[PDB]
Swiss-Prot record, chain B:
Role of this protein: Catalyzes the formation of S-adenosylmethionine from methionine and ATP.
GO function terms (MF aspect): ATP binding; magnesium ion binding; methionine adenosyltransferase activity
Chain positions recorded as ATP binding sites: G141, Q142, G143, S144, M145, D146
Name of the protein described by the UniProt record: S-adenosylmethionine synthase
Reaction catalysis annotation: L-methionine + ATP + H2O = S-adenosyl-L-methionine + phosphate + diphosphate
Disulfide bonds: none
Length: 408, 406
């Protein structure tokens, strides 16, 4: 019998697929910006587990600040040279020392060492051809703050946090054909299965999707690992092999559309200027990266959908409402899109300062209905879903800490 | 035959929608400091390359990390405790090979970059001591050969796109958008700060519209050397509040405008938004590039946005910058057309293609009532073509500092 500020409105516009144009981009796992996002969030999760193990609660921190400076390299067919390591700077802030006045004690937490280790372990996980011992420098200037033990005691209650702000989050569902194709192309090209078959395929993968009516053009940037290509001929063969597999994929999930595929379009075979790398990422020299300049929490960049500019990765999963709302809005929209009669769904969430985060100032649900469905038949089910997720706001926090949801 | 596409868009105009959220991070905000420094470095390197070779060489310094410092604010004047650390980064042509001498010649990228960053900081932070309050480090590195090759391939003709990217633009600005934009610009204008030197440059403005009610929330750093006490601080807030009220009446006529300033203040305990330098960077707050305003100067989740960070990217062939400026220019001109209520422009590149040959130049138009898109389409198409014909004027506008990147 709990009452919230939930709004359901019928959205009387053309669905996304019926609109004539779509542009969708995804920065893959080995992309420098995605590397930074992933490190930012991995450090946060590591600190969360650090806090949980000591206190059984999560303390204030934000590590949504990571800078990747491109290294120096000399690619060469058969195996190139890494000259200067990739330099990564961890930044942000985290609670480090707890001042207890009652007890005459100070507890200090391994903030910096935890951070550096988390970053290193994430890099080891995603970058097959980077030797993290020699190819990377992980520096750390994360601020180390203090906190009164009494405030720790309060946090240990693990009550729903209050919104300390008027913040916004937006999400939508379902993914369009173009969105789905862009997303799964990158996922496939960075899957273990493909790597094993075509080890020359690096992790620095970018996928741009343009839809014109019922024609989808995929433009793929793909770093080739030079130890696996003996010459320009073998380089070409890798491109064609990848093209074939992407064609097959397009048939599987974009059947009915005309699909056109372009790979490494900056290449000039004549001048022998191609996307050749030593490590499989342009972070080795070609490009730099930092946090919040890539994918939204749904894993896409979508100028035909509403987007939040806030950088989710690295933000406090406890009390940063913007991060929580953008993830929550996505989770809610996804379930509402599963409902019978829902063609398209947009969810916007706005916080009420001074109020619990799961008691928003407004939660707006916009639904494009399928033909012959009444929005008023759907609305009850929709509000129930939204209220269910809001009741379980603390479960959303857990999902983030356990990495069961994406932040990029 | 350019790939220009024009569509009628049948949705509710933004002004008529019930809710609107708009944000602007002012010049002194840590993220905007980074954007500003990034662009200053690029402009400086452009000038240096031009002086030495009569041409611009490959670079992209769209990477600046600001690690917050620490300070001790105090009425009448406080002091810095730990310097703000800023890391200049990105790609740049660091050296050239003298093929005849068979020797490497180093270019002054590092010195040019560090000087440019310091000069910019001096400009936007009146009360910062760059010798004591800030550390500017530099790790800009050589770009890859493939990057340089694409840059040089047709630099003398029509440059080839540095990347596969899209830019976005739209027009006109809504009442809320213009209010947020002009509030910050006004409060960070030299004329106002000369009148009220207590006003720091770190000004964050957020506009929330609900119907015809606009709530303006302002977070404004106050410079503690210009406020003797909590009372003088209070007088600053109310002076600024009066100014913004007057401004709102001029450009938001017919709307109910609420103005909330530094809402986290606690006068009872004298815990207020006091700073030594006029920026929250001194408070341990961090910044980086492309975390804030788009090229139109706003953050707009109810408008289409590009995630590209224009600041610091080279103005020759990086479409991540050029197409975002170009899209804004085209949208503005189309918005001038009678029968056009709203216009959205999206411009997509393909890496290696001439920058005047976008893979798609996408135009959406909300028409005024009783106007035919068929009458508007040819005009919109001509504006787009006109601009692609003059695409080199974009570079020229950027280099001459005639447009903003944030
Ligand atoms: N040779 C390449 N061809 C295609 N894509 C690339 C190449 N190198 C890197 N990328 C991918 O593009 C991303 C941004 S890169 C950003 C450019 C900028 N950092 C620069 O300094 O040149 C693009 C790029 C870099 C070097 C050569 C060619 C390109 N390019 O035309 O695309 C980068 O993060 C990679 O994922
Ligand atoms: Mg980038
Ligand atoms: Mg920020
Ligand atoms: Mg980009």
């Amino acid at each position: 019998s709990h009452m919230r500020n939930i709004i359901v409105k019928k959205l009387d516009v053309e669905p996304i697929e019926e609109r004539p144009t779509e542009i969708v981009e995804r920065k893959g796992l080995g992309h420098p910006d995605s590397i930074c996002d992933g490190i930012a969030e991995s450090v946060s999760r590591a600190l969360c587990k650090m806090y949980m193990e000591k206190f059984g609660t999560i303390l204030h921190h934000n590590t949504d600040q990571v800078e990747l400076v491109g290294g120096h390299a000399y690619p060469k067919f058969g195996g190139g040279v890494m000259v200067s390591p990739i330099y990564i700077l961890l930044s942000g802030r985290a609670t480090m020392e707890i001042l207890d006045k009652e007890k005459n004690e100070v507890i200090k937490l391994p903030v910096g060492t935890t951070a550096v280790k988390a970053a290193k372990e994430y890099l080891k996980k995603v970058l097959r051809n980077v030797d993290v011992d020699k190819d990377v420098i992980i520096d750390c200037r994360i601020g180390q703050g203090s906190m009164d033990a009494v405030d720790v005691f309060e946090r240990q209650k693990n009550e729903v946090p209050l919104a300390n702000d008027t913040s916004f989050g937006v999400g939508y569902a379902p993914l369009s054909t173009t969105e789905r194709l862009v997303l799964e192309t990158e996922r496939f090209l960075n899957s273990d299965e493909l790597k094993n078959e075509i080890p020359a395929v690096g992790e620095d993968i970018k996928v741009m999707g343009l839809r014109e009516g019922k024609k989808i053009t995929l433009t793929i940037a793909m770093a080739v690992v030079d130890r696996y290509v003996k010459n320009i001929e073998e380089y070409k063969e890798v491109i064609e092999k990848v093209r074939k597999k992407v064609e097959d994929l397009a048939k599987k999930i974009a059947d009915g559309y005309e699909v056109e595929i372009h790979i490494n379009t900056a290449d000039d075979y004549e001048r022998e200027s191609v996307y050749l790398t030593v490590t499989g990422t342009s972070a080795e020299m070609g490009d730099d990266g930092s946090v919040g300049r890539g994918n939204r929490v749904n894993g896409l960049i979508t100028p035909f959908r509403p987007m939040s500019m806030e950088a989710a990765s690295g933000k406090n999963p406890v009390n940063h409402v913007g991060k929580i709302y953008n993830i929550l809005a996505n989770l809610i929209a996804n379930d509402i899109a599963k409902l019978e009669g829902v063609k398209e769904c947009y969810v916007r969430i706005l916080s009420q300062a001074g109020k619990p985060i799961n008691e928003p100032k407004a939660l707006d649900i916009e639904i494009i209905t399928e033909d012959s469905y009444d929005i008023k038949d759907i609305e009850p089910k929709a509000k129930e879903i939204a209220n269910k997720w809001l009741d379980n706001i603390m479960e959303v926090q857990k999902m983030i800490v356990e990495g069961k949801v994406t932040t990029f």
